Amino acid sequence: KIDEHTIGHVFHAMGVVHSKKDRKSLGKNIKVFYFSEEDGHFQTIPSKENAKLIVYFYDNVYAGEAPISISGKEAFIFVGITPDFKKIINSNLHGAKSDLIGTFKDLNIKNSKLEITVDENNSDAKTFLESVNYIIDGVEKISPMLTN
C-alpha cells in the first residue's frame, strides 16, 4: 500500500485539492507501479525498494517519483504530469528542501522535454531539470500500461 505521508506527496504533485481527513480514504484509489531502470528500459518490480522510477495514477492524472541527490543529500522528487504529456502539475521533495519547487510547476512539456532554461551553475536546478525530464521519459514509456 502507500503510507499517508507518501499520499500527501503524490496528491500535492497531482494538484489533487483534498482535505487531510480524506487523504487515506482517497489514497486507496491510487494505482502504483515500481520500476527498475537499466539503460533507458523500465521493468516492473514488486516494491519500492531499489526502484528507479515509481509511477502513481489517480483520477486520470500521473505522478512520477525518483531518487535524486539535492546538495549532496539523497532524496526523492515527485512530479505530476497531465495525461496528454503536455504539462507538469506540481513538484515536491522528500528528504531535502529547495525553493526550486516554486519554479518546477505548471510548465509545458514539448515532446517529453520541459520548456525551461535553468541557471547552468546551480547544481540543484540542473538536478531538478534532469530528474523531471527523466521522469517524463519514464512515465511516457510505461504509459501503455495506464492511459496510453
Q: Which residues bind Zn ion (CB under 5 A)?
A: 94
Minimum CB separation of residue 9 from Zn ion in Å reads 6
Minimum CB separation of residue 39 from Zn ion in Å reads 30
Q: Counting beta carbons within 10 angstroms of the beta carbon of residue 40, is it exposed (0 to 12), middle (13 to 18) or buried (19 or more)? A: exposed
Minimum CB separation of residue 78 from Zn ion in Å reads 9
Name which of 23 and 94 has its Cβ closer to Zn ion: 94
Name which of 3 and 22 has its Cβ closer to Zn ion: 3
**Helix residue ranges per DSSP H, the chain:** 4-14, 23-27, 123-142
Q: Which residues does 43 contact at the CB level (< 8 Å), separation at least 6?
A: 35, 36
| Cα–Cα dist 90/41, whole Å | 25
Minimum CB separation of residue 5 from Zn ion in Å reads 5
Name which of 61 and 75 has its Cβ closer to Zn ion: 75
Name which of 10 and 125 has its Cβ closer to Zn ion: 10
DSSP reduced 3-state for 76: strand
- The closest residue (CB) to Zn ion is 94
Name which of 94 and 141 has its Cβ closer to Zn ion: 94
| Cα–Cα dist 80/88, whole Å | 5
Minimum CB separation of residue 16 from Zn ion in Å reads 16
Phi, psi angle pair for 32, to nearest 5°: -135, 135
